[PDB]
Amino acid sequence: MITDGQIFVALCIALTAAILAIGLGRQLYV
Amino acid sequence: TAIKPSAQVVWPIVGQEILNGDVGGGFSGVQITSGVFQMWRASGITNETELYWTAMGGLVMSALMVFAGWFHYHKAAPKLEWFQNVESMMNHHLAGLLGLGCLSWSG
Amino acid sequence: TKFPKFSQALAQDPATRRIWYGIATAHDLESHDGMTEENLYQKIFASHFGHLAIIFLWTSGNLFHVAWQGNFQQWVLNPLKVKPIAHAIWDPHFGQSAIKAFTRGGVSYPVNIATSGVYHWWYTIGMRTNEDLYFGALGLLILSTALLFAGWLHLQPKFRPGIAWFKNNESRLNHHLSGLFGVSSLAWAGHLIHVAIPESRGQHIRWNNFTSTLPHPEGLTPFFTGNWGLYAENPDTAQHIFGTSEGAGTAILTFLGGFHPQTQSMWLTDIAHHHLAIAVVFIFAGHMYRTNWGIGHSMKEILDAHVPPKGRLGSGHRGLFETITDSLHMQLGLALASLGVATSLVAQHMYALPSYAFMAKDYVTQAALYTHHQYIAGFLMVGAFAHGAIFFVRDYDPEVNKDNVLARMLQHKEAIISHLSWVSLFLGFHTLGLYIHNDVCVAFGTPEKQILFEPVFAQFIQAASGKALYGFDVLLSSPTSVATVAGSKIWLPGWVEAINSGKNSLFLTIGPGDFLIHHAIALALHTTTLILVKGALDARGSKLMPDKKDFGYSFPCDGPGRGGTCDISAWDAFYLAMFWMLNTIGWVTFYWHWKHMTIWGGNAAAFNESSTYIMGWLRDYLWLNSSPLINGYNAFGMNAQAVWAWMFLFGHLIWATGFMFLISWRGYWQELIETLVWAHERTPIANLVKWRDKPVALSIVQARLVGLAHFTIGYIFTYAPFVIASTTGKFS
Amino acid sequence: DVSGLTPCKDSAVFKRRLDGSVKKLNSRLANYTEGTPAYIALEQQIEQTKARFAKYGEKGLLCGADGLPHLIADGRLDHAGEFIIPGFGFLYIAGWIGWAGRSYLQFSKKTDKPNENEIIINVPVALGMMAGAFIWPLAAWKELIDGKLLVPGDEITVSPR
Amino acid sequence: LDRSEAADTWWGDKDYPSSVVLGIGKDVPSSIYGVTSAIAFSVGAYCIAQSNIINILSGSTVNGFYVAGALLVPYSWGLHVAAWIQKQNGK
Amino acid sequence: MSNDLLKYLSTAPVLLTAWMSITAGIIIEIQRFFPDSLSF
Amino acid sequence: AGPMYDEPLAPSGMGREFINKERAPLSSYVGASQELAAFPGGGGKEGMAPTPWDPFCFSELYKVSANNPDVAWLRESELKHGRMAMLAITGVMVQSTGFHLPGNAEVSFANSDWVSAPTTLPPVVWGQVLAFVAIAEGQTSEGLFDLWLGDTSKREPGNLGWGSGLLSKDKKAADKMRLKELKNGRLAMLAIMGVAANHFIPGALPGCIY
Ligand code: CLA
Numbered sequence A: 001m002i003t004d005g006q007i008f009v010a011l012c013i014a015l016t017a018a019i020l021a022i023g024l025g026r027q028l029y030v
Numbered sequence B: 001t002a003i004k005p006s007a008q009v010v011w012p013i014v015g016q017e018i019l020n021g022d023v024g025g026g027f028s029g030v031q032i033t034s035g036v037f038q039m040w041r042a043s044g045i046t047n048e049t050e051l052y053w054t055a056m057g058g059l060v061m062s063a064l065m066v067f068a069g070w071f072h073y074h075k076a077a078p079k080l081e082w083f084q085n086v087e088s089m090m091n092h093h094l095a096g097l098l099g100l101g102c103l104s105w106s107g
Numbered sequence C: 001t002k003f004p005k006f007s008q009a010l011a012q013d014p015a016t017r018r019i020w021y022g023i024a025t026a027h028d029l030e031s032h033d034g035m036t037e038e039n040l041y042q043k044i045f046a047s048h049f050g051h052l053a054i055i056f057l058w059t060s061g062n063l064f065h066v067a068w069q070g071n072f073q074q075w076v077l078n079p080l081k082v083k084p085i086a087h088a089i090w091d092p093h094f095g096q097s098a099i100k101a102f103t104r105g106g107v108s109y110p111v112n113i114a115t116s117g118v119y120h121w122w123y124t125i126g127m128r129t130n131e132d133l134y135f136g137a138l139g140l141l142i143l144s145t146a147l148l149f150a151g152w153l154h155l156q157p158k159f160r161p162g163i164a165w166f167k168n169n170e171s172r173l174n175h176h177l178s179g180l181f182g183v184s185s186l187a188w189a190g191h192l193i194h195v196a197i198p199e200s201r202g203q204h205i206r207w208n209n210f211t212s213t214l215p216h217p218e219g220l221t222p223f224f225t226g227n228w229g230l231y232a233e234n235p236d237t238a239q240h241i242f243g244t245s246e247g248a249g250t251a252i253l254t255f256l257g258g259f260h261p262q263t264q265s266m267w268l269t270d271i272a273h274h275h276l277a278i279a280v281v282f283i284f285a286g287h288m289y290r291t292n293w294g295i296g297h298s299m300k301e302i303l304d305a306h307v308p309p310k311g312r313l314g315s316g317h318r319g320l321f322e323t324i325t326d327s328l329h330m331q332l333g334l335a336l337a338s339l340g341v342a343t344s345l346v347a348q349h350m351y352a353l354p355s356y357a358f359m360a361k362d363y364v365t366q367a368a369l370y371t372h373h374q375y376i377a378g379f380l381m382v383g384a385f386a387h388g389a390i391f392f393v394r395d396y397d398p399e400v401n402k403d404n405v406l407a408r409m410l411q412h413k414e415a416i417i418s419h420l421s422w423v424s425l426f427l428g429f430h431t432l433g434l435y436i437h438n439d440v441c442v443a444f445g446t447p448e449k450q451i452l453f454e455p456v457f458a459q460f461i462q463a464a465s466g467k468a469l470y471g472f473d474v475l476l477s478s479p480t481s482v483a484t485v486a487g488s489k490i491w492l493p494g495w496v497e498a499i500n501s502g503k504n505s506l507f508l509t510i511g512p513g514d515f516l517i518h519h520a521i522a523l524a525l526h527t528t529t530l531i532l533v534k535g536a537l538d539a540r541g542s543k544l545m546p547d548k549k550d551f552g553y554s555f556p557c558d559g560p561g562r563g564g565t566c567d568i569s570a571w572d573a574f575y576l577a578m579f580w581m582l583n584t585i586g587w588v589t590f591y592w593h594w595k596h597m598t599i600w601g602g603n604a605a606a607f608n609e610s611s612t613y614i615m616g617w618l619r620d621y622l623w624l625n626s627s628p629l630i631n632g633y634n635a636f637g638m639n640a641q642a643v644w645a646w647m648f649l650f651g652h653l654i655w656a657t658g659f660m661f662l663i664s665w666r667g668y669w670q671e672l673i674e675t676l677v678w679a680h681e682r683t684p685i686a687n688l689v690k691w692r693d694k695p696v697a698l699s700i701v702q703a704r705l706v707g708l709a710h711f712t713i714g715y716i717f718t719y720a721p722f723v724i725a726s727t728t729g730k731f732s
Numbered sequence D: 001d002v003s004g005l006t007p008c009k010d011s012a013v014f015k016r017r018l019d020g021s022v023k024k025l026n027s028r029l030a031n032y033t034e035g036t037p038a039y040i041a042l043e044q045q046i047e048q049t050k051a052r053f054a055k056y057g058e059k060g061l062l063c064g065a066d067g068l069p070h071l072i073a074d075g076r077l078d079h080a081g082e083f084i085i086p087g088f089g090f091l092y093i094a095g096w097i098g099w100a101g102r103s104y105l106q107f108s109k110k111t112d113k114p115n116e117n118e119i120i121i122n123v124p125v126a127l128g129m130m131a132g133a134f135i136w137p138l139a140a141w142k143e144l145i146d147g148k149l150l151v152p153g154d155e156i157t158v159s160p161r
Numbered sequence E: 001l002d003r004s005e006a007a008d009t010w011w012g013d014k015d016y017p018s019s020v021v022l023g024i025g026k027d028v029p030s031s032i033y034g035v036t037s038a039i040a041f042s043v044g045a046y047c048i049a050q051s052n053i054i055n056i057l058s059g060s061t062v063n064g065f066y067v068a069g070a071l072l073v074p075y076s077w078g079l080h081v082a083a084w085i086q087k088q089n090g091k
Numbered sequence F: 001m002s003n004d005l006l007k008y009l010s011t012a013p014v015l016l017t018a019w020m021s022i023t024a025g026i027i028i029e030i031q032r033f034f035p036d037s038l039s040f
Numbered sequence G: 001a002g003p004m005y006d007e008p009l010a011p012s013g014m015g016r017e018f019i020n021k022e023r024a025p026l027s028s029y030v031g032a033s034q035e036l037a038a039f040p041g042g043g044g045k046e047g048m049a050p051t052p053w054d055p056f057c058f059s060e061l062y063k064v065s066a067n068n069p070d071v072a073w074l075r076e077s078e079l080k081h082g083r084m085a086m087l088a089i090t091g092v093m094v095q096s097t098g099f100h101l102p103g104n105a106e107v108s109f110a111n112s113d114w115v116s117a118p119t120t121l122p123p124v125v126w127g128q129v130l131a132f133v134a135i136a137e138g139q140t141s142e143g144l145f146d147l148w149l150g151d152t153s154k155r156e157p158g159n160l161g162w163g164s165g166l167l168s169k170d171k172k173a174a175d176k177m178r179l180k181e182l183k184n185g186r187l188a189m190l191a192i193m194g195v196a197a198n199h200f201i202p203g204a205l206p207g208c209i210y
């Protein structure tokens, strides 16, 4: 049984990946 | 009601004789769906000699039409003035073609 | 600074085609304004990083959803009865009946039943609880984060690799074969021997105790002493039950062959030995090329001096190194062709030699995986040929390839195209003729007249592999054969029983239907290759258009002059060959699905009798198996296959909508849009709201692309519901 | 015997198929009376069916599990009549047709009006070419040896490579 | 490896290839190449025969020194090709 | 009849129709006299 | 620009002029047979006909393409087949009488079935024969790709250098001996293939004794 805290830390890592993806997209655009 | 109308028969060549299905009346053939049987029943044809003779008459009419088509181009072709008589054409097609056609069919 | 900043022409374009062409030329970096080779390579590198990040995010998402919403733990106990769950459904449009119907799989909420085999794969490699899946998802998320950071980093000024580094072929090939292939396969063999075989034998090996637990009781002492047969001694017994210690052996590297009897899947010891051996071979292969020390090879020297005597192949392979290392399209085409062949190979091998536990009895997953990988193989092959054509029209230098092995292809392209046309015409004429002959013979109630050809050569190959029902008695089928004698002690004792056992898909029995459908497949492959080869070879020019290379790869036409020049650009030869790709993969998947459905039902006589004529194909496969799909929802109610029925009709709709773009062309729609423009400009109130880009009909190539995409998407979205829903409803 | 097949003479499924076809016709036969054209035609149908099955049995065809003849096309002369003999027959006829066409084209080009000779066939000489094409394998070999079958390679247009 | 760092090995005009294609073996005499080729082929055939044919290969017991030497058959092929190349090069 | 009608009958479609009718007749009559010949 | 109707597809400066040069004719080869030209009127003398026999014209098929072999290659192959067939027919005739080498415990050369005679021997005994044939046919063959394209310069067809000195110095007698070789080789080829055909299907050669 996956816990709510486990889902939350996974979501935090996903948000970090989102920020890095935005940065990579900006650098690819320029 | 019981007999299935059929007026086409296939020859036996490559096993296509299976298409001559059981249509009733001791006859084997391909069932038709053109309504010509009911048409002839309405017209009053009750025997096959009548069908044969109207077929021969149709052949004579077809030959007459081919002759007329040849004649009206190669022997006696009308003029544009003749063709452009639309009023006379309408008079003859209303009263002469449709009117007398309906009158004769009614008779 | 309009949206297509990379294309000043499209920026100045005032119509609505600016948006379309910018979107579809966004990734055509070679043709971008003010572009250099070094910047092109660096941007490609960064995009590769982003793509790898996306792949790992997709994998982590699958793992997380199965861990959180899937019944993996329940499925582990009873794999053959519990239906695996993909993910939960959240839909405020569902009715109570829909919620009740989609509540399944031993859970209290609506769900989707997984048809990807991920449950079987994870169970085989040794995942037993949702925690393991969750930690794998976290690891993949961290890996994606690292890859995104790398992609960002390598676009920085001090971290931008150079063109020489990019074009260093020898070092790249050495490392991508000795490490990426070899060491990675060695790592997978290590994972199997350390975690998967113990878990299949009833041992919980995880990160907290894999250091302490020995993979073998002997340890590495046999390995260092050279008594390597100790690791093959004591294999798993035929009474073994997967995941339990009863009937479990101690061997870690074996060559038993055949299949594990309970799971009807290959032995994990065999798989570990496979990966270890192939890792050794790859590591040896990866020391071929010269990199910084002296030993090695020079690919330029090899290609240059490989020329046969008396100019048989012209000047040989001179200049091919230059063209390949300069043109990225040739490299892309070679990679796509190799990957398409590999995808066809995995599609053909997964069903014949299942590797994951209990996948053989999971009929839906097998068909889904086969259809999936065959379709992707077709896509990759068409892409390989398309990029070969782009290389010819964009990157081919006849001065460099003066009398080359590649230039002689253009020299005798007419002969190649004519012979492809001949073989395609012959196969099509005679296959269709035999099929129609059988159709008419059965139609006239005389099946005895059918022209039924036994696939004698394929049956001979099956006998040589070990089949015995045909009675050929050749090679491995012959007990006296030297091949059988030589192999009798390693793998043949398992392989012979596996192949001769009738409950398996390994070397299926074949007949006249197999003969005819195989020749149809040959027709389709040869015709697709004809279209693609003609496009690639006539891309540079033709008798109707010798200066096609000046116009480029994808242009609409040359006008109605010279009789008409529709579909002449050799992009239109991709477009036209995509139809044949869909056709051939559809025939292949129809064949696979029907021949497997009958065998799963224990009714192979139906295929052997009805597959010899197209009426039988239409009646006993499509019409018969379409009932559970179309009955997904009806007037009386709805089942869990209502989603599949909706999709079948949705794919039908998309496929039919593609015909509009493919048939009706641009002038009609341009005039219609002119009338609509008049109406909008002349109506009151609405005329205050006014466009910025002048509306125009879609371009010729744009609409060809859109119609082809509609055709393809309708194709896949109307066949996938059929192949999944019918297999699920019949469960056979 | 090859590939697990058996002859159609000792084929229970083949015999069952024969009896099923015979029983189907004899049933359909009930609708019509004795001596009628349809009755005698169905009797011909039954006789032809039985003759076909007997001929298939006698010819030595191999019948599979489905009870239908299977043709073996690999080269074995035990089953030459299935493919090898019809194959050579078709090859001869097709080469006859191609040779007649080629020779007529060779004639018609030399004519003053080849374009009109192609759509209005000079039948008196065309029949001559059809007749003379009977010996095409020797004629083709002779023309090949004399260098008149193939046009050289750089006398035929070819597009810009 | 750069494009410039490569010797000119193309030999389409010539009847035989230059000895530069042999790499490190460019200076090896043809007689030595041929005799070593014969020895290598004989040894490799012997090893394969003793591994697989004379004794049927058993998974429990494989010699290893017969697995090695079986690779000398490709080596023998290369050696006899190089023997021919050196013979035509007169080296 | 005349050179003109002979030329017209020698035209391509008339000749193709006549020749293919002859071929179909030959095949049909061969089927009638040697029916159901699956092999030589 | 040569005997061939088409230029070779091999390129200029890499073989084209080598293939497309003049080649010797069939008439300049010692193979004519008086027996074929043995009838009233036209005929030959000294065992040779005035013209060679080639109904199918395989000799001059090079003019169509250089894929087809040259008359030099064809004569080389003819003499090879003839020599091999002469040895083969002599071997089967001698073996079928029952004469055999002494033998020992290891080897037994006693077998009259010429078809299965090699099968009786140990692996080594026929292995040596096959190895000798493999080495010799492969060492003596140098410049055979040159006889195919037609350059009878380095290698004469059929002249391996074995006992070529015993050929007479007179051209007439040398050609006579070469013609005797060719005739005996062709007769032996027919004989050995006839015996093989008789074995495979009986009755192919009615005069058989083996
Ligand atoms: C390190 C990797 C590794 C390990 C641990 C094992 C372990 C085992 N293998 Mg081996 N195997 C390997 C790699 C490995 N293999 C490779 C690369 C291949 C070639 C594809 C094979 C092919 C193979 C077969 C076919 C069989 C085994 C079997 C065995 C068992 C006994 C072998 C033995 O006693 O050899 C002892 C040998 C040594 C101590 C010396 C080996 C030195 C080698 C020859 C050096 C050269 C390697 C060469 C260049 C690499 C390329 C391969 C080349 C031979 C073609 C054991 C479980 C048998 C088995 O389990 O049957 C049930 C069996 O039948 N193996």
Ligand SMILES: CC1=C(/C=C/C(C)=C/C=C/C(C)=C/C=C/C=C(C)/C=C/C=C(C)/C=C/C2=C(C)CCCC2(C)C)C(C)(C)CCC1
Binding pocket: C329, C330, C332, C333, C334, C337, C341, C381, C384, C385, C387, C388, C389, C391, C392, C536
């Ligand atoms: C246009 C172009 C292009 C493209 C191309 C392509 C796309 C191709 C493809 C191709 C392909 C896709 C191919 C394939 C092939 C294959 C093969 C060739 C195979 C082989 C095989 C084998 C050899 C095998 C064998 C074996 C074994 C080993 C074991 C078992 C048995 C057997 C016998 C089976 C490019 C880019 C280049 C560029 C230029 C132009």
